[PDB]
Scaffold this active site. Sequence first.
Site, short mmCIF file in Angstrom:
data_model
loop_
_atom_site.label_atom_id
_atom_site.label_comp_id
_atom_site.label_asym_id
_atom_site.label_seq_id
_atom_site.Cartn_x
_atom_site.Cartn_y
_atom_site.Cartn_z
N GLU B 357 0.89 -1.06 0.08
CA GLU B 357 0.13 -0.09 0.04
C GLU B 357 0.90 1.25 -0.20
O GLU B 357 0.57 2.22 -0.59
CB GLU B 357 -0.95 -0.25 1.26
CG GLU B 357 -1.93 -1.27 1.31
CD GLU B 357 -2.60 -1.49 0.02
OE1 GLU B 357 -2.13 -1.99 -0.89
OE2 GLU B 357 -3.80 -1.34 0.05
N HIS B 487 -14.67 -11.12 -9.87
CA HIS B 487 -14.62 -10.06 -10.58
C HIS B 487 -15.48 -10.43 -12.04
O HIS B 487 -15.97 -9.60 -12.73
CB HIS B 487 -13.02 -10.16 -11.12
CG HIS B 487 -12.12 -9.55 -10.27
ND1 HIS B 487 -11.78 -9.99 -9.17
CD2 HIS B 487 -11.54 -8.20 -10.23
CE1 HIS B 487 -10.87 -9.13 -8.50
NE2 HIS B 487 -10.88 -8.13 -9.16
#
Lengths: 194, 597
Positions: B357, B487
């Site tokens: 991150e 997805h």
Amino acid sequence: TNLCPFGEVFNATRFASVYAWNRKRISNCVADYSVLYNSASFSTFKCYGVSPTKLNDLCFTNVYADSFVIRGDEVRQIAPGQTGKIADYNYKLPDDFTGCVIAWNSNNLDSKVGGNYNYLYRLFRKSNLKPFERDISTEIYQAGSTPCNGVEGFNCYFPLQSYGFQPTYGVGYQPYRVVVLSFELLHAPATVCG
Amino acid sequence: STIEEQAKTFLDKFNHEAEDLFYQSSLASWNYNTNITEENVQNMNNAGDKWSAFLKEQSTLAQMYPLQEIQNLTVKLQLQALQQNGSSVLSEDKSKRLNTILNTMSTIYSTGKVCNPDNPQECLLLEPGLNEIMANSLDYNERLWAWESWRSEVGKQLRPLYEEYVVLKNEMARANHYEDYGDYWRGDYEVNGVDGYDYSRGQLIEDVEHTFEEIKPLYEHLHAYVRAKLMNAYPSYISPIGCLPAHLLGDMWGRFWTNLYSLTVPFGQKPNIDVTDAMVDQAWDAQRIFKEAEKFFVSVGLPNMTQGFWENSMLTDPGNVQKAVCHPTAWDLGKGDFRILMCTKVTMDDFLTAHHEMGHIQYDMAYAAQPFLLRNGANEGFHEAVGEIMSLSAATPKHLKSIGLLSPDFQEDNETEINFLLKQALTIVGTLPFTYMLEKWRWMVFKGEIPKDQWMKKWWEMKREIVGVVEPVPHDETYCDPASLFHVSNDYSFIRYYTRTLYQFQFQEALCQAAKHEGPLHKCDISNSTEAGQKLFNMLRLGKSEPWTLALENVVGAKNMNVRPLLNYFEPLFTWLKDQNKNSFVGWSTDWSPYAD
Ligand SMILES: *[C@@H]1O[C@H](CO)[C@@H](O)[C@H](O)[C@H]1NC(C)=O
Ligand SMILES: *[C@@H]1O[C@H](CO)[C@@H](O)[C@H](O)[C@H]1NC(C)=O
Ligand SMILES: *[C@@H]1O[C@H](CO)[C@@H](O)[C@H](O)[C@H]1NC(C)=O
Ligand SMILES: *[C@@H]1O[C@H](CO)[C@@H](O)[C@H](O)[C@H]1NC(C)=O
Ligand SMILES: *[C@@H]1O[C@H](CO)[C@@H](O)[C@H](O)[C@H]1NC(C)=O
């Protein structure tokens, strides 16, 4: 013989936006700069023509103390020979700039949750500005060819835009207050130094 | 005067409107995602509707401008990004039915629940039920039943929904002058009218084809090794000459093979590398993790994170008074505000994800100054690319030996490094075949070359030939197995992961060769090498303003995708498998089935 009232200038609470940059003439008083210098708690203090100290015992006929608020990254915009939105359409500096430019962070005051919208700045204009001129005349900038008779719409946008000031901004977007002290050297009698 | 100056003026005003609206929306969504409260969601949906309707009306206003009557490239890029009306342009009835399709499939996938044939009121949802069901369990029957059942409950429901979804979507893409919708997903990579960097949509299909062609042998050895090991784990359900059980891929599908690592440890006697107990004993906390990540990123010359980032972001589990969806995410609220959201514990996995991150947020910190629509990666993969490269770097034993998390007298050598390689393989080599299989499958679907009455049938063939996994259940046209995954069911373009996987390793080679590293790549670190950091920044500062391949070349010197970075990265593991597989086969037959008894 009075002290030049820089005090209630530098730390008043109502500063206007740049598009109506505030100005107060300082004269007929003795000026104590070195205190404002050695304040040394500002995020930027530059100027163009004299050492911060030597300006003390060398003096002028009149000075203009102008104030406004801009966005962080655009502090670089305010200097002779600088371009950009606040430099070209909102506040233009002469190139033989006599004054000084001080600027401090003000995120803890001038911004607030939800985003303040009192602060403004002009976004477009037919052409850049003269040195040192204020413009509150706000007729719609003509972006396209069709004259739209003063309305918001396609190719008709309002020349002013409100700064976004949420206090959670990066330092580059947090508001920064700016004061500039343009000195003049003319033929008037003993009105400015200390 | 002209058209182009007018377009630039438009984009200027649009920047300082959309910036602010996006800030409002992002901040509201954040304040939700950090503290689950109702009126938070209310104001969040309010701001989101505001931003969305504003974007739609801006697109409608923008299509009032000719495209080719603009010459400065950047403007053309922004206007193609903005003016693409997409699904919004189709008929309001059909768009409403479409929105319903989205919410319907998504909610059925995210609320679908499988219940054992014995207990109608004891049973499990997917998250986190079926995940651990398929991961932690060793049970043959449990995994088999779970596989078929989860393919039965939601997928068989969503089958015609996804069908008509493809139909309306392809009609939509035709309305967008695209040949079909998979082409539209490709279109993000498409690059037009710039010399030395042209790129067609089909140029991409050629790219992915060839990339996987050279990938083939690596994954083939991978399949061989895993097949051998699981056979040792399941002698009654694996023959060493065929495909692999579609219910034993550690998860419901085989998107990652990390779970099988526990099973296929290359050497189950050498200690694995973890400093969790170490970071405990040295009294570390999440705060210190992220501070050390900042130290690392300084060590490459990038700027340390903003003060506002430290004082503002939410870095640890905010007690037990409030709950939130604190899955590791990195937010760029724009206008100089950058935050990281993660219920950070203290472990090696958190140490890696924190750097991941941090790479995200640094990446975004790079291109702050570009116009609005350029505030995203050169592609739809570079974000996770930079997020994965920093992690990969920090996860080497040597860089840990640097800041004192490992025993300075550690002995790292053959067996342990092949262990680390095969683990990272099951992590990253796993996604290539499965991902590409699914992506090209969906591409043919949008290309309609497959009759609906055979979708599933050809489906497993692609699984068969390309990836090598055999179905455990006979499948007629009762199945909708693609939607059985997030997805797909949630309608996300799936190539971006394949592309990311390639780009990160091209980056790895480029930076280690630019950091004057000598020797094995799998042990590489970028830190303390300001030159390589400057190299990387030279691309980060572009975002997507330049054509993406120009950005890539600004790092690797190749103007196209390259897989040889990957095979080189692994070549230790490559030779190791090439030895391991002398007495066992590589390759499989397309007829076999575990229920073809
Ligand atoms: C305004 O704030 C400054 C701190 O930056 C302080 O030094 C100054 O004294 C304040 N103004 C007055 C009139 O006290
Ligand atoms: C979560 O938000 C609500 C509403 O703003 C607030 O009252 C509450 O204090 C927040 N949670 C915590 C732990 O502060
Ligand atoms: C496009 O416009 C920007 C600013 O309007 C300018 O900096 C840039 O040089 C222009 N493109 C080219 C190729 O000159
Ligand atoms: C961030 O790094 C710069 C690099 O020199 C340093 O000057 C600065 O002090 C660091 N940040 C803080 C808050 O000290
Ligand atoms: C980076 O450089 C510092 C300064 O000498 C050193 O203490 C540290 O061990 C180095 N780390 C790596 C990974 O090179």
